[PDB]
Scaffold this active site. Structure first.
Site, short mmCIF file in Angstrom:
data_model
loop_
_atom_site.label_atom_id
_atom_site.label_comp_id
_atom_site.label_asym_id
_atom_site.label_seq_id
_atom_site.Cartn_x
_atom_site.Cartn_y
_atom_site.Cartn_z
N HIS A 72 0.65 -1.16 0.24
CA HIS A 72 -0.23 -0.41 0.07
C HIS A 72 0.57 1.40 0.05
CE1 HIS A 72 -3.86 -1.44 1.63
NE2 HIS A 72 -3.56 -2.86 0.67
N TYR A 201 -9.54 4.85 7.89
CA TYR A 201 -9.40 5.76 9.13
C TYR A 201 -10.55 5.93 9.51
CZ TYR A 201 -5.37 3.10 9.86
OH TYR A 201 -3.78 1.97 10.28
N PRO A 293 -3.93 -0.68 19.29
CA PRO A 293 -4.21 -1.05 17.64
C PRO A 293 -3.74 0.38 16.25
CG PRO A 293 -5.10 -2.85 18.71
CD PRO A 293 -4.96 -1.48 19.53
N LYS A 297 1.16 -0.80 14.86
CA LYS A 297 3.05 -0.92 15.65
C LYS A 297 3.07 -1.99 16.18
CE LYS A 297 4.10 2.15 13.22
NZ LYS A 297 4.33 2.34 12.17
N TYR A 385 4.16 6.31 10.38
CA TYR A 385 3.34 5.16 10.46
C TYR A 385 3.62 3.83 9.19
CZ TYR A 385 -1.60 3.22 8.94
OH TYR A 385 -2.17 1.52 8.37
C1 FAD Z 1 -7.27 -6.07 16.83
C2 FAD Z 1 -5.69 -6.27 16.65
C3 FAD Z 1 -4.92 -5.66 15.83
C4 FAD Z 1 -4.24 -4.92 15.45
N1 FAD Z 1 -3.41 -4.87 14.68
C5 FAD Z 1 -1.79 -4.51 14.08
C6 FAD Z 1 -1.06 -4.44 12.64
O1 FAD Z 1 -2.28 -4.12 12.08
N2 FAD Z 1 -0.53 -4.48 12.71
C7 FAD Z 1 0.92 -3.91 14.04
O2 FAD Z 1 2.38 -4.14 14.05
N3 FAD Z 1 0.26 -4.50 14.96
C8 FAD Z 1 -0.90 -5.08 15.08
N4 FAD Z 1 -1.32 -5.47 16.53
C9 FAD Z 1 -0.11 -6.39 16.97
C10 FAD Z 1 -0.09 -7.57 17.16
O3 FAD Z 1 -0.98 -8.58 16.92
C11 FAD Z 1 0.85 -8.06 18.41
O4 FAD Z 1 2.14 -7.26 19.06
C12 FAD Z 1 1.80 -9.86 18.10
O5 FAD Z 1 1.27 -10.58 18.21
C13 FAD Z 1 2.81 -10.03 19.34
O6 FAD Z 1 3.31 -10.93 18.91
P1 FAD Z 1 3.85 -11.57 20.16
O7 FAD Z 1 5.23 -12.58 19.32
O8 FAD Z 1 4.29 -11.30 20.94
O9 FAD Z 1 3.25 -12.30 21.24
P2 FAD Z 1 1.56 -13.33 21.07
O10 FAD Z 1 0.94 -12.82 19.25
O11 FAD Z 1 0.57 -12.92 22.29
O12 FAD Z 1 1.71 -15.15 21.09
C14 FAD Z 1 2.40 -14.47 22.47
C15 FAD Z 1 2.85 -16.11 22.63
O13 FAD Z 1 3.00 -16.75 23.61
C16 FAD Z 1 2.08 -18.38 24.48
N5 FAD Z 1 1.80 -17.80 25.72
C17 FAD Z 1 1.67 -17.34 26.96
N6 FAD Z 1 1.94 -18.19 28.21
C18 FAD Z 1 2.87 -18.39 27.92
C19 FAD Z 1 3.77 -19.31 28.81
N7 FAD Z 1 3.20 -19.20 30.32
N8 FAD Z 1 3.93 -20.73 28.09
C20 FAD Z 1 4.09 -20.46 27.38
N9 FAD Z 1 3.80 -19.80 26.09
C21 FAD Z 1 3.53 -18.91 26.39
C22 FAD Z 1 0.94 -17.60 24.02
O14 FAD Z 1 0.40 -18.81 24.00
C23 FAD Z 1 1.40 -16.97 22.53
O15 FAD Z 1 0.81 -17.92 21.64
C24 FAD Z 1 -2.93 -5.96 16.50
C25 FAD Z 1 -3.75 -6.51 17.79
C26 FAD Z 1 -4.85 -6.67 17.64
C27 FAD Z 1 -5.23 -7.18 19.06
#
Ligand code: FAD
Length: 391
Positions: A72, A201, A293, A297, A385
């Site tokens: 985009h 948006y 969100p 980021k 952005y």
């Molecule tokens: C509605 C929404 C829209 C979003 N849009 C965007 C977007 O457009 N662009 C963007 O950059 N970001 C966006 N985000 C954010 C993005 O989804 C997250 O920041 C990303 O999921 C985080 O990745 P992570 O690997 O740190 O954590 P997570 O995705 O939370 O994964 C963490 C993992 O750790 C595991 N875990 C938890 N506790 C334990 C434990 N005790 N032992 C073992 N495993 C465990 C979990 O089960 C999970 O699998 C959005 C989020 C949401 C909710």
């Protein structure tokens, strides 16, 4: 069991770090509390920064993204009967953003890992970290009732907002910065063609609305709702009616609706923890910080944390320069705070806040009018952005 780097959590942070490290010859074991299926059910992110895209290419998992990802060059902001396009490519100096779902990125990484044969333990229950300040830290968990012990050199806490890692740093060592917003986002995923080639948006008197997508036949829509709402009180029919109410008439009339594939409410919050490490433990992604969100980021910050951690672990293992790991938090926090400021700004100018006086409403409108009407104002939105440079 012994490995070099133990990684807690198989979301995109842990998987991306595990892939980069495996390819560089650094052995790692990922421990995940849930099942692959559960992880693959989380919709979440849709927008990726170029830095995240390049990192996926470096990890060797970019084939499908390159093929299916939508690049985009602009986004649109609608308010007070106006629709303003921000030309990200022009105003940021050629940078763009890629739309490719987090479910997809995760699938691609899970596949690359399975094929490489690197160790992954799903359904690892009761994970506990030990001897974080020693030279020999270890992780204990249970698989099939048996409690196993995993010895390692370093631990990467990539367990998200509800993980166990952050709880393993002495409370009297941490500084938590938090802000909860009085609203959440009701999201609806549908198998319909998006209403626009670019995201929209919308700041509307009824509240925020966002028109996003996943592909040419798959859409993702959101509307701001009070924290008191229950997803079961929102039928597909009710969602479409509300969404149409918050969009420009010409946009609302081109909307192809349809039944939902997924529907959920995500509350908004900002959360930062300092420092992001303790002894042999390093936190990454949602485990260390949360951004609303609005600015897209979260996943993108996890990517830079991971890129930073990976590069510092390479120096330590490959070049025997382990002292560099002490700089982890400092490097990351600089990028984190700027992304937090932008996500906070975006959130405050696009949403409807409860109990807001006349002066503030007026200022909110003026912020939009100024930033979207000034060449310098537009450039601040665009450079933030597309994503600020990695350090
Ligand atoms: C509605 C929404 C829209 C979003 N849009 C965007 C977007 O457009 N662009 C963007 O950059 N970001 C966006 N985000 C954010 C993005 O989804 C997250 O920041 C990303 O999921 C985080 O990745 P992570 O690997 O740190 O954590 P997570 O995705 O939370 O994964 C963490 C993992 O750790 C595991 N875990 C938890 N506790 C334990 C434990 N005790 N032992 C073992 N495993 C465990 C979990 O089960 C999970 O699998 C959005 C989020 C949401 C909710």
């Amino acid at each position: 069991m012994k490995t070099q780097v133990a990684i807690i959590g198989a979301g995109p942070s842990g998987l991306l770090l595990g892939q980069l490290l495996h390819k560089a010859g650094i052995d790692n074991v990922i421990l995940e509390r849930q099942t692959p299926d559960y992880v693959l059910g989380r919709i979440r992110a849709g927008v990726l920064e170029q830095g995240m895209v390049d990192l996926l290419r470096e990890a060797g998992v970019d084939r499908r993204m390159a093929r299916d990802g939508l690049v985009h060059e602009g986004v649109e902001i609608a308010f007070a009967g106006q629709r303003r396009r921000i030309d990200l490519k022009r105003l940021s100096g050629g940078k763009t953003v890629t739309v490719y779902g987090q479910t997809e990125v995760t699938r691609d990484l899970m596949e690359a890992r399975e094929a490489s044969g690197a160790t992954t333990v799903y359904q690892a229950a009761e994970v506990r970290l030990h001897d974080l300040q020693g030279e020999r830290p270890y992780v204990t968990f249970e698989r099939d009732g048996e409690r196993l012990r995993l010895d390692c050199d370093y631990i990467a806490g990539c367990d998200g907002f509800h993980g166990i890692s952050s709880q393993s740093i002495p409370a009297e060592r941490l500084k938590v910065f938090e802000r909860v917003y009085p609203f959440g986002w009701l999201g609806l995923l549908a198998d319909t063609p998006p209403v626009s080639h670019e995201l929209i948006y919308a700041n509307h008197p009824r509240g925020f609305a966002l028109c996003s997508q996943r592909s040419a036949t798959r859409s993702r829509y959101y509307v701001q709702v009070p924290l008191t709402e229950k997803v079961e009180d929102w039928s597909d029919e009710r969602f479409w009616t509300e969404l149409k109410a918050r969009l420009p008439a010409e946009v609302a009339e081109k909307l192809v609706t349809g039944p939902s594939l997924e529907k959920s409410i995500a509350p908004l919050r900002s959360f930062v923890v300092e420092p992001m490490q303790h002894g042999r433990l390093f936190l990454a992604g949602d485990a260390a910080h949360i951004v609303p969100p609005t600015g897209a980021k979260g996943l993108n910050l996890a990517a830079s944390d991971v890129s930073t951690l990976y590069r510092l672990l390479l120096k330590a293992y490959r070049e025997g320069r382990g002292e560099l790991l002490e700089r982890y938090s400092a490097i990351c926090l600089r990028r984190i705070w700027k992304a937090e400021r932008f996500s906070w700004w975006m959130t405050s100018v696009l949403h409807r806040f409860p109990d807001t006086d006349a002066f503030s409403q007026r200022i909110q409108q003026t912020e939009l009018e100024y930033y979207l009407g000034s060449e310098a104002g537009l450039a601040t939105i665009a450079e933030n952005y597309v994503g600020l440079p990695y350090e």
